[PDB]
Swiss-Prot record:
Key words of the record: Antibiotic, Antimicrobial, Defensin, Disulfide bond, Secreted
Cellular compartment(s): Secreted
Biological process per Gene Ontology, one example term: defense response to bacterium
InterPro entries for the chain: Defensin_RK-1
Role summary: Has antimicrobial activity against E.coli and activates ion channel activity.
SUPFAM superfamilies in the record: Defensin-like (SSF57392)
Family named by the database record: Belongs to the alpha-defensin family.
GO cellular component terms listed in the entry, alphabetical order: extracellular region
Official protein name in the record: Corticostatin-related peptide RK-1
Species of the source: Oryctolagus cuniculus
Pfam families tied to this protein: Defensin_RK-1
Keyword Ligase in annotation: no
Length: 32
C-alpha cells in the first residue's frame, strides 16, 4: 500500500482519510 493506516501519522507522513471499523484509525498517506 502506498498509503498506510495508523492512529497518528509519521513525522514525514500526513493524514488522508479514516481507516478501521468506526473510522477510529486514520488513512495516513505519504507527503508527496
Amino acid at each position: 500500500m502506498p498509503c498506510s493506516c495508523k492512529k497518528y501519522c509519521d513525522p514525514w507522513e500526513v493524514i488522508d482519510g479514516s481507516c478501521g471499523l468506526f473510522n477510529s484509525k486514520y488513512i495516513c498517506c505519504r507527503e508527496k
